[PDB]
Amino acid sequence: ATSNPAFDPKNLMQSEIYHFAQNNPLADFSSDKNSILTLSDKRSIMGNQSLLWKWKGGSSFTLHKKLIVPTDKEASKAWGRSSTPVFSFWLYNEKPIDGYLTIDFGEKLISTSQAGFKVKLDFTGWRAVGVSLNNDLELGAKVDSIRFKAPSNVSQGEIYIDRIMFSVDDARYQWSDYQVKTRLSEPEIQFHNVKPQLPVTPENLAAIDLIRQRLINEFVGKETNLALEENISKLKSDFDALNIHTLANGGTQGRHLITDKQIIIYQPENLNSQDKQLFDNYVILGNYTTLMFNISRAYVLEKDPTQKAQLKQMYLLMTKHLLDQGFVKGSALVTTHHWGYSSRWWYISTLLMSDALKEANLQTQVYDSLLWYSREFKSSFDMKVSADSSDLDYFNTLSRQHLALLLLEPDDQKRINLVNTFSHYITGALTQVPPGGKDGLRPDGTAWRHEGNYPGYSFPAFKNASQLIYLLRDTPFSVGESGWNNLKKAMVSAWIYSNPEVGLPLAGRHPFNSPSLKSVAQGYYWLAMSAKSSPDKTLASIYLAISDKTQNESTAIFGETITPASLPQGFYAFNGGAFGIHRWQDKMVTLKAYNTNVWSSEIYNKDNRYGRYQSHGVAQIVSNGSQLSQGYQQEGWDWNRMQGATTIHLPLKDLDSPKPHTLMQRGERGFSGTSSLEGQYGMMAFDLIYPANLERFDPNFTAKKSVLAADNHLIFIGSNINSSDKNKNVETTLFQHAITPTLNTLWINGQKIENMPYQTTLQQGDWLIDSNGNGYLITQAEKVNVSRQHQVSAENKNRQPTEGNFSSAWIDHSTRPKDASYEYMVFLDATPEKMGEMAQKFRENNGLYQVLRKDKDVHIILDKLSNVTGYAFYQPASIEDKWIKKVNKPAIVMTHRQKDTLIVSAVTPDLNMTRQKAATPVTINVTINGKWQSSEVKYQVSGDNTELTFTSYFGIPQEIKLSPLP
Numbered sequence: 001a002t003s004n005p006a007f008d009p010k011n012l013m014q015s016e017i018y019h020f021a022q023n024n025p026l027a028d029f030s031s032d033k034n035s036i037l038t039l040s041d042k043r044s045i046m047g048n049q050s051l052l053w054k055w056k057g058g059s060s061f062t063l064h065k066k067l068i069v070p071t072d073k074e075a076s077k078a079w080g081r082s083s084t085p086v087f088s089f090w091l092y093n094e095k096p097i098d099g100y101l102t103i104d105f106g107e108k109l110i111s112t113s114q115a116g117f118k119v120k121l122d123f124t125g126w127r128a129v130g131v132s133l134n135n136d137l138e139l140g141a142k143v144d145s146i147r148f149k150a151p152s153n154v155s156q157g158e159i160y161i162d163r164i165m166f167s168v169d170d171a172r173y174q175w176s177d178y179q180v181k182t183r184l185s186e187p188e189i190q191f192h193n194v195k196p197q198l199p200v201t202p203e204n205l206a207a208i209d210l211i212r213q214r215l216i217n218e219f220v221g222k223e224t225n226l227a228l229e230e231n232i233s234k235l236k237s238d239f240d241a242l243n244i245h246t247l248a249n250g251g252t253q254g255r256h257l258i259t260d261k262q263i264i265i266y267q268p269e270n271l272n273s274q275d276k277q278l279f280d281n282y283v284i285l286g287n288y289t290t291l292m293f294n295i296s297r298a299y300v301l302e303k304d305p306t307q308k309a310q311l312k313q314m315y316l317l318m319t320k321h322l323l324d325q326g327f328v329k330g331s332a333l334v335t336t337h338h339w340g341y342s343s344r345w346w347y348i349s350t351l352l353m354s355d356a357l358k359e360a361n362l363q364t365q366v367y368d369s370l371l372w373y374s375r376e377f378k379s380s381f382d383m384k385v386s387a388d389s390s391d392l393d394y395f396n397t398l399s400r401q402h403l404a405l406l407l408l409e410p411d412d413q414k415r416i417n418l419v420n421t422f423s424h425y426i427t428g429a430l431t432q433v434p435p436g437g438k439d440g441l442r443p444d445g446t447a448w449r450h451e452g453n454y455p456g457y458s459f460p461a462f463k464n465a466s467q468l469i470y471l472l473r474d475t476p477f478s479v480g481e482s483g484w485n486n487l488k489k490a491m492v493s494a495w496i497y498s499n500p501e502v503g504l505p506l507a508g509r510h511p512f513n514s515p516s517l518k519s520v521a522q523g524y525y526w527l528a529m530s531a532k533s534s535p536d537k538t539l540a541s542i543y544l545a546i547s548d549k550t551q552n553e554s555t556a557i558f559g560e561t562i563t564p565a566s567l568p569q570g571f572y573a574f575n576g577g578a579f580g581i582h583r584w585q586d587k588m589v590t591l592k593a594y595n596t597n598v599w600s601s602e603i604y605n606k607d608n609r610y611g612r613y614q615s616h617g618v619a620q621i622v623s624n625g626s627q628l629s630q631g632y633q634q635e636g637w638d639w640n641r642m643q644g645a646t647t648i649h650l651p652l653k654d655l656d657s658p659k660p661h662t663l664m665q666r667g668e669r670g671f672s673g674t675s676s677l678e679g680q681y682g683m684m685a686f687d688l689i690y691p692a693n694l695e696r697f698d699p700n701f702t703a704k705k706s707v708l709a710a711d712n713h714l715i716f717i718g719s720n721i722n723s724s725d726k727n728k729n730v731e732t733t734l735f736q737h738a739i740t741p742t743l744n745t746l747w748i749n750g751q752k753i754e755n756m757p758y759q760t761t762l763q764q765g766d767w768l769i770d771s772n773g774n775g776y777l778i779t780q781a782e783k784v785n786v787s788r789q790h791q792v793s794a795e796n797k798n799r800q801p802t803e804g805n806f807s808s809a810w811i812d813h814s815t816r817p818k819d820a821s822y823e824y825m826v827f828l829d830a831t832p833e834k835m836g837e838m839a840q841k842f843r844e845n846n847g848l849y850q851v852l853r854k855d856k857d858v859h860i861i862l863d864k865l866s867n868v869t870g871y872a873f874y875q876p877a878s879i880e881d882k883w884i885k886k887v888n889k890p891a892i893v894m895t896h897r898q899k900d901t902l903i904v905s906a907v908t909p910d911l912n913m914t915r916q917k918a919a920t921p922v923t924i925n926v927t928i929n930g931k932w933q934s935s936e937v938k939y940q941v942s943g944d945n946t947e948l949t950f951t952s953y954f955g956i957p958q959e960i961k962l963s964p965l966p
């Protein structure tokens with residue numbers, strides 16, 4: 001509080017705050033006959049004093065202060081987001097009052113004399129009032145009077161007031177409560193309830209009290225986002241610093257409590273220095289509720305009873321302070337948005353302290369409070385199964401807090417009903433295929449957030465939904481098998497595409513900080529141990545493999561001997577992120593494309609700036625372990641040269657995303673992704689097409705990039721490669737990896753190269769091995785550059801410059817101005833001796849493989865080592881082949897002739913959906929040559945050939961073993 005008016009054009013963003021820690025603190029205040037104004041030093045929000053206002057009814061005191069009340073425009077411009085100016089104060093009732101406080105504003109007001117609003121005084125403890133001065137009254141510019149009037153209808157009474165504040169606030173966040181009406185209401189939770197209801201029995205009550213216990217077990221013997229403190233001497237010291245003293249005739253004095261979001265109303269950074277020093281003595285709810293939960297764990301584990309007793313008292317005094325501060329049902333506190341961040345550990349803390357809260361007679365207030373403030377999550381907490389109920393953030397940060405609030409219901413019949421309903425909710429939520437790009441599991445094992453497959457949001461969702469099914473296992477509240485089967489598809493799928501980090505292609509907006517399966521390991525145990533036929537061996541063997549445990553350790557954990565899982569082998573299609581995984585020995589290759597329904601990349605204001613090529617027909621080879629150890633180093637990484645990728649080599653100023661905030665660039669057609677055969681073999685098909693006019697994106701840049709994966713190798717081909725600039729700087733990257741003392745060695749045609757720098761160029765018949773033991777034989781190219789060199793780059797968050805030394809090799813496509821092509825072959829078990837034999841076999845008429853067609857319509861790769869053929873129909877076509885004659889849709893087809901059966905697989909990686917519409921199954925006619933008979937694939941012999949009817953749903957390949965008709 002300065003003599004400068006509120007919302008001074010001169011300093012619009014500077015809050016004016018009546019807090020009474022200044023001199024002649026009531027100078028700006030006048031009362032009438034029938035009101036007295038004192039300071040009490042006994043309760044306070046800011047400073048250590050508050051306005052004790054004693055009043056006959058009808059009485060009034062005026063606050064003399066000039067207000068240059070802006071428009072919603074002026075204030076929005078001053079700050080930078082939709083804004084309003086807000087009138088806001090705290091008041092305490094020691095005893096409720098049956099009637100309304102009037103706040104009126106005008107010019108040179110007295111007792112007897114524009115617009116104002118009402119506060120219902122029927123409550124005790126602190127409440128917070130918060131109005132937009134443009135939208136919540138019933139305004140001029142020349143206002144100097146704010147007059148508080150006690151109700152006519154009450155005869156006398158007494159109100160403490162503090163922190164009367166004019167300030168610029170976010171216009172989403174002045175909320176209606178049981179005291180004040182605003183334009184804004186966050187409606188209270190209305191629990192769905194499923195039929196038939198479970199009855200209160202001793203059985204059903206024992207399950208509830210067990211679920212509570214299994215929950216307490218999980219938080220008393222490490223959680224992400226929990227600032228765990230086991231040291232009692234620290235909890236004690238922290239609690240002391242709060243200065244909470246019980247007051248004689250009810251409630252507390254202590255340091256004022258505020259959420260991370262509540263502090264906005266103050267506009268802290270613009271606060272006069274008097275006001276910022278007082279704002280600094282506030283406590284952040286998040287730290288407070290973290291200390292409560294840390295205390296509740298300490299109490300549940302403490303053996304010494306004197307100290308166990310001291311812990312209970314601490315927790316109870318902190319609960320009382322919390323409710324006296326006006327964190328109770330019907331108190332909005334102006335707002336509480338992002339309540340999860342400030343309170344997630346309060347929810348859980350009530351589980352550990354259920355009994356103490358019962359004795360202290362606080363269980364009913366504390367449930368009422370958490371239930372009010374939970375109205376924010378109404379669309380999950382209400383527990384009606386919708387299209388949005390499969391949200392992966394809720395499974396991470398909200399699911400256990402939700403169950404904890406349910407378990408705190410006083411009435412036994414209501415508790416069972418809520419937990420019964422919450423089981424049917426969770427089941428639906430992990431069972432349903434959400435429409436479009438809505439969050440949640442999908443039929444192929446993918447798991448969507450931000451409208452796409454997203455390991456970085458699914459991995460923590462997988463851990464906590466696994467733990468949820470385990471808390472309810474073998475009870476009448478146990479989750480449906482459908483939800484258990486589906487979470488398992490997803491988590492087996494994550495074991496397949498991790499090794500143990502997900503690839504760079506699946507790093508989302510966080511390249512080089514891939515999520516690890518290591519942080520989701522407990523989930524493999526929870527899910528194994530919660531199977532209808534427990535334990536599930538598959539999931540158990542994954543748990544042992546991921547958590548680094550021996551067959552010997554398994555019997556204690558799972559109660560029978562299970563061999564830790566050996567790394568998945570073969571090929572798995574995952575067209576929900578237009579990708580596939582090839583696994584051989586300890587290596588995983590992430591093949592990634594994109595399309596209408598799969599963004600190439602997530603790029604935000606400060607994430608993945610150089611991400612443009614994340615999904616450009618990439619094929620990152622990762623051996624089991626740390627990717628950084630294998631030289632996937634961000635420092636000096638050449639963002640143009642993602643392994644496998646056909647790109648234009650831009651400078652970083654131009655590779656940087658054109659949109660300064662958010663771009664998630666979707667493809668130009670439905671068709672790109674992978675398909676599998678016999679679970680051993682894959683083909684990628686990627687049609688590279690750029691937008692017709694997006695800044696920094698060459699509209700004429702194109703490629704058809706196909707890959708056929710079998711056993712220890714992959715055949716890579718390219719056709720119809722074009723740019724606006726005759727393929728100037730158009731490269732296909734074979735590999736890129738850091739040089740270290742451990743990753744020191746490149747091989748070229750039998751020769752070790754350890755030199756730094758080093759450049760050379762290669763052509764057809766040449767070969768290399770990188771420091772990770774991947775060999776590249778070049779089978780059709782004019783010009784393959786090799787480089788060992790100091791590279792300069794920039795990190796994907798704040799584009800700050802980096803550098804390091806890299807080994808790299810790429811095809812230079814600028815030697816073919818129109819329709820540039822390539823072929824190369826990757827060996828994953830490579831050595832100088834075996835690559836020399838592979839090269840000899842290549843020179844013997846290519847006994848490695850034959851390309852039977854390579855154009856804008858079809859690629860066809862026959863792999864002669866595997867005796868498998870892959871067919872990438874970029875367009876429907878009739879072809880000439882031993883096996884496949886005609887496909888009437890863009891598709892990926894595969895053949896393997898084995899002794900006297902022909903196995904055909906088919907799919908469209910096209911998901912056949914939009915961001916809103918739900919996927920429907922595309923029907924693919926594959927005619928094949930000659931007569932066959934034999935799986936949900938249909939076959940009809942028509943003339944001297946055979947029509948196959950593959951049903952492609954969410955790009956899940958189907959196949960059929962045929963045998964030949966005489």
Ligand SMILES: CC(=O)N[C@@H]1[C@@H](O[C@@H]2OC(C(=O)O)=C[C@H](O)[C@H]2O)[C@@H](O)[C@@H](CO)O[C@H]1O
Nearest residue numbers: 392393394449450451452457604605661662
């Ligand atoms: C605000 C922004 O940049 N993006 C929005 C998304 O929010 C991000 O992701 C999440 C999350 O919980 O999933 C939290 C953080 O607020 C932010 O990093 C998200 O709402 C998304 C939905 O597709 O779209 C953006 O508006």
Ligand SMILES: CC(=O)N[C@@H]1[C@@H](O[C@@H]2OC(C(=O)O)=C[C@H](O)[C@H]2O)[C@@H](O)[C@@H](CO)O[C@H]1O
Nearest residue numbers: 224225396397456457460508510513514515
């Ligand atoms: C995709 C994403 O941003 N997920 C969020 C978390 O980030 C991941 O986890 C961590 C970490 O080690 O804490 C670092 C990286 O940011 C990323 O792999 C994290 O912000 C979390 C906090 O609640 O929310 C996740 O969804």
Ligand SMILES: [Mg+2]
Nearest residue numbers: 019046047049
């Ligand atoms: Mg004060």
